[PDB]
Design a protein around this ligand. Structure first.
Ligand code: HEM
Ligand code: HEM
Lengths: 726, 726
């Protein structure tokens, strides 16, 4: 018995804030959170307590510390089958990572529609507001490998497996509403250009290198999604505070056979929020697992990620009514033109038990649709349909990947497919073909119908010759990048210019930087000039005179394209660092902590060492982390209570903690003598917007700080940080 | 879509300093650098210039931009075999990463011995000082995945494949002289404890988490290698500046049949150097590919990594003469007791052409020995001999991994093995068994002998019962960690205390911290008290009274265990940042560059934007990177010439550059009006050792900076950095 007798090895099976208890497998942390998929995995969940250690053949092991040898200092013997099984298993633990989106973090949850959508789709999962569908969701980055960092600048994947009563539907989306390329034939080119360069395999997790920008400079279709990656959309605060999009136009099909075009959206109920670049890049070093950690810990705290599914619907008669083609995945549909209709809510409320078994082996594929949905001829979508089933034959070892437990449907599945590696199901049908008489033709085809019918494709007319040709309707590249640029606030535009400037500075061949800047000049002269200035490039008179692309259907901006132009702040589940001293003013800390708790904001108590400190009134304060152990990168705001401020006033880490938070536009609150830190961040005596300061943490101090938190960052500080040495 | 007319897309095929040209495949960068193995790969090298793009079947492609569809806005057709081949290959590009040491960087080179070693070994590659053996070397970290960061705290792998005339010998070593565990049966337990925890797969690249420290606290045999990992050995500056060790005792066997025990060493001819923790961890975010890039660039510059192979030799009759067991891989052999005899030199002088095909697919295995070498009964080595052939069956797809080009011997190989997946070799032998008459028994066995003989194992006597039992002589765990601790300088001891304090601060369950501090108290009470203080733990009276472990065969210290106690600095291949201004004093820059050039030290010219700046004499200076783009973490020293210092005096990034370099103990040199930066880092008018300052850069100024660089870091500054907010 190695566990401590006090039971402190084991986390409480109740919701607890981040850092209060060790994390645990979801079924041990939240045993009473259930859904139909999580219950169906009970057949394969394996416990451990009170069981004997055995080989995989069920033979009990007596000595798991030693190989069998001839003499205690002698050679190891080949007949040691217990050693060889253990090491064989170990030796073959790894499977290939996903070719793209290899770095991802997943959780279980459930979806429910707000109302029946039977007028527009016969999909069973959207038929009844009382019908709950379990989901499994994986969020990801794109370029880096499974052991790369979370807070890179990249697009994010947002993939949802809906375990419906009429089959698995996978909605395999990203966090921007378009893609970089138009036709799937180019996907290996684009991905090879953004991935580490093939001679030396550098850089990981970064598009900031010559081959990415070479491709971009030569393929202007990429410029719209490059604009989104360069904006703060490319560095989200958390998977909870980003949007999701299916990108492509798909179809909904109703029981009368009417097709409606649809684009899928997820709205984050926590609001939209991103980091700033220097913070994101630094955080990839201080905590490369920051998003995976934040997701897991938000679920263990009960801060469940929630998202609203929404549809942009366009009738079939309106296919050609826009300046852009609905089938072009480099074009977005502005919400000012076509509103998102709210459809239902997804809640992710349980972490997996075993990351490899559930996250690593999960297989999502956008070809997994159900009756009531159909495809369109978007030429990127069309190639995706080939790839996601093909890639599993090597990644997951064969064609029985649907029998891996996480991928199994919860509804019935029966057919005449047999064998393959890893075959789990033992078919008892006398027939393995149809038509057959020997089993009366079962399992049988089902005609299409309003409910529980077979799948039939919408009978779209096709007319044309067999060609390898891009539609001329797709040959417009600059207007949507411009619409995005003009929709951002002034600080978002500054961050876009700084993103392109930093990335192009890492491109070693200067002519590629010049070719990118020339593309920028086809989008917006202000953007191109500001990027060119940071690169020491002067635009030519010809570039200064390029006429801007046309507005999109008359729009010169759409505020739903900005992260921050329309406030949607939510403080619940955010975290504040509290910088302690060795005799904290306990009344300040009571007021601070209870105000945060009331709004669901978490706290981490920091000091210059671990263990405890004692407040003025004798209260014993446990320390969560040190100033360097839990840097300001990992929090949303910083509060310094009064007390013996001389204890930390000359601590370089305490001072730097405030400088780094200040640089990264975070709210900072200073009570009492903690106001002596104003000199460190060069605040004037009469104060400044974004710094909360008072004699004590009472009265309006916490309300002011929480108001700042709801607005996320102090954008007005940007010209001030510009010269702080941090 | 084509190359620039000036040819600047293509790097010069001559040696160039880092940053001067884009990096390139080795065979294009150094076409005249050859060796027998490099030549042998010509059969599979594929060019590209002037060739038509084709399918893998050799059919020319006309349009690689579009899928075949029915009309240009129509559905993609299943008969598009060109799209499907391209996307199938892409979908199957990934293979499983190595179970451990997945992150690694490799290069080609050659080895030769200084003199024949035929008196102690019949190994052909050690028999003649003028017979050169090609090598392929991979350096690696242990824990993280292939996409994790380079400058983590971890043990490093140092694996060398020698392509000898009598077979492939792989010397598969690490950068510390011991391992964490005694018997291979525990390898999966230890690896699972240090790897990301199974519920959530966090943390990547870090031992700073509960399960690792749980395992260490319960298995004190780990403490020796844990001491090495917590020292600055865990964070080398470059793979060129670390030691290598085979860890195990092996045997040499000479032509008369005599066995000598041996342990293998690599000594870095560039000297030993490591980062400091804050620098290392921040660099994982600013350049996660820092070691891979520095190795590739040193080779492109001509700063070839060189290492000296050395042997510790113990005669067979001295097996039991030490106070530790020679077969215990958690024990080192102190060089004060058994000196390292210099054996030969290895030079890495060419980068690979394709990282996947050469680095990712290389397979090293310590059971690949040759006549003149043999194993011992070390119980960790014994189990390794199983694992490295087993694991390639999944990683490399079957038993023909030796036909993957990088793994092929360059000597003859012939036998009766046949088939297996992706069999390349077409055997014409009418026999596939022996003995056979139908091919007159070829290929034939060869008796052992002095040279070109068959392998025979040394006929070691074996006497014991079949037991799973640890030798009692391996049950001592504290004396080697203590010897290591006492052999470090004071600043190295401080960094060890900091490494344990940082790591255990991230262990969430406090009792695990307490248990590790109790282990430390069994090694050295000063170490244990210093770690306990940082953790808010007080040692008990019983803990204060633990008797120190014994000295190791009378030694109180061995300075060969320290990175820094004995000067061994070599500045060739190091890099300095030069902070420019918009009117640099050209006479300062001339003097700086001339002095750096004479010592082989590279420079990177930095500014607040990219492009060029002009010096006072009209010299146009191209800018390598911005201050933020290439932080001080990436260089060894910082020099600031005079000129228009007002241009940069108030720039936050330039001031921070100096504060970060100062904190990280790097030499700084300030000329002329650049001395006004003394105020940012609080240097007294009188100056400080480690800050070079003068009215102009000249011979004396550069000689002083260069002397500082030869000592690597400014250890005397340590007490002055805790107050610095950086
Ligand atoms: C609209 C543009 C696209 C979006 C929104 C998208 C989204 C995603 C996401 C989120 C994943 C990760 C699934 C997971 O978390 O497990 C993924 C995986 C993948 N996608 Fe895509 N993708 C796009 C384009 C493409 C294209 C053009 C192809 C190839 C024809 C492709 C082939 C793949 C493959 C091979 C994987 C790995 C899947 C697996 O191993 O199971 N994707 N995609
Ligand atoms: C002295 C202790 C050990 C040392 C110094 C060591 C060293 C290394 C190194 C340097 C590598 C990376 C080689 C490369 O660059 O590809 C490696 C890989 C590996 N080792 Fe070890 N190792 C040790 C113990 C063990 C043990 C006890 C086992 C299991 C019985 C083991 C099994 C493996 C496996 C399966 C790989 C990956 C091999 C591949 O896929 O090619 N090693 N080891």
């Amino acid at each position: 018995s190695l566990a401590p007798e006090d039971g402190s090895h084991r986390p409480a099976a109740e919701p607890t804030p981040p850092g209060a208890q060790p994390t645990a497998p979801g079924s041990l942390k939240a045993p009473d959170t259930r859904n139909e998929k999580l219950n169906s995995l009970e057949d394969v969940r394996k416990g451990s307590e009170n069981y004997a250690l055995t080989t995989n053949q069920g033979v009990r092991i007596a000595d798991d510390q030693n190989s069998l040898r001839a003499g205690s200092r002698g050679p190891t013997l080949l007949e040691d089958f217990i050693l060889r099984e253990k090491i064989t298993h170990f030796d073959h633990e790894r499977i290939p990572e996903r070719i793209v989106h290899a770095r991802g973090s997943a959780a279980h949850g459930y979806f429910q529609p707000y109302k029946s959508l039977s007028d527009i789709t016969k999909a069973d999962f959207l038929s009844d507001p009382n019908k709950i569908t379990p989901v499994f969701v994986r969020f990801s980055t794109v370029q880096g490998g499974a052991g790369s960092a979370d807070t890179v600048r990249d697009i994010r994947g947002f993939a949802t497996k809906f375990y419906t009563e009429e089959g698995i539907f996978d909605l395999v989306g990203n966090n921007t509403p378009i893609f970089f390329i138009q036709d799937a034939h180019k996907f290996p080119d684009f991905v090879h250009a953004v991935k580490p360069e093939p001679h030396w395999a550098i850089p990981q997790g970064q598009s900031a290198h010559d081959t990415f920008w070479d491709y971009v400079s030569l393929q202007p279709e990429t410029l719209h999604n490059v604009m989104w990656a360069m904006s703060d959309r490319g560095i989200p605060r958390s998977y909870r505070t980003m949007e999701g999009f299916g990108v492509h136009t798909f179809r909904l099909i109703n029981a009368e056979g009417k097709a409606t075009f649809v684009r899928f959206h997820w709205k984050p109920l926590a609001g939209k929020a991103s980091l700033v670049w220097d913070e994101a890049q630094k955080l990839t070093g201080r905590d490369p697992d920051f998003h995976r950690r934040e997701l897991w810990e938000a679920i263990e705290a009960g801060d469940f990620p929630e998202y609203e599914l929404g549809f942009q619907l366009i009738p079939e008669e309106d296919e050609f009514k826009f300046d852009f083609d609905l089938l072009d995945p480099t074009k977005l549909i502005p919400e000012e033109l076509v509103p998102v209709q709210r459809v239902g809510k997804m809640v992710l409320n349980r972490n997996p038990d075993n990351f490899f078994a559930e996250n690593e082996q999960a297989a999502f594929h956008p070809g997994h649709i159900v009756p009531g949905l159909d495809f369109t001829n978007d030429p990127l979508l069309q190639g995706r349909l080939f790839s996601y089933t093909d890639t599993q034959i090597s990644r997951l070892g064969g064609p029985n990947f649907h029998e891996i437990p996480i991928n199994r449907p919860t509804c019935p599945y029966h057919n005449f497919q047999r064998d393959g590696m890893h075959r789990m199901g033992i078919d008892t049908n006398p027939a393995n073909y149809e038509p057959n008489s020997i089993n009366d033709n079962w399992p049988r085809e089902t005609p299409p119908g309003p409910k529980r019918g077979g799948f039939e494709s919408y009978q779209e007319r096709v007319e044309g010759n067999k060609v390898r040709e891009r539609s001329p309707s797709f040959g417009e590249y600059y207007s949507h990048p411009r619409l995005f640029w003009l929709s951002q606030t002034p600080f978002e535009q500054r961050h876009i210019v700084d993103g392109f400037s930093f990335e192009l500075s890492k491109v070693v061949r200067p002519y590629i930087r010049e070719r990118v800047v020339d593309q920028l000049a086809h989008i917006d002269l202000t953007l191109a000039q500001a990027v060119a200035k940071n690169l020491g490039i002067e635009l030519t008179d010809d570039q200064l005179n390029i006429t801007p692309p046309p507005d999109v259907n008359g729009l010169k901006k759409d505020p739903s394209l900005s992260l921050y132009a329309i406030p949607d702040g939510d403080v619940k589940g955010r975290v504040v660092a509290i910088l302690l001293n060795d005799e904290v003013r306990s009344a300040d800390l009571l007021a601070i902590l209870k105000a945060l708790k009331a709004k669901g904001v978490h706290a981490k108590l920091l000091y210059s060492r671990m263990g405890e400190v004692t407040a003025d009134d004798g209260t014993v304060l446990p320390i969560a982390a040190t100033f360097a152990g839990a840097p300001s990168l990992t929090v949303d705001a910083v509060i310094v209570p009064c007390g013996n401020i001389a204890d930390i006033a000359d601590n370089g880490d305490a001072n730097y903690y405030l400088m780094e938070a200040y640089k990264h536009l975070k709210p900072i609150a200073l009570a009492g003598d903690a106001r002596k830190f104003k000199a460190t961040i060069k605040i004037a005596d009469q104060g400044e917007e974004g710094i909360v300061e008072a004699d004590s943490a009472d009265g309006s101090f916490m309300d002011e700080l929480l108001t700042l938190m709801a607005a996320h960052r102090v954008w007005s500080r940007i010209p001030k940080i510009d010269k702080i040495p941090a």
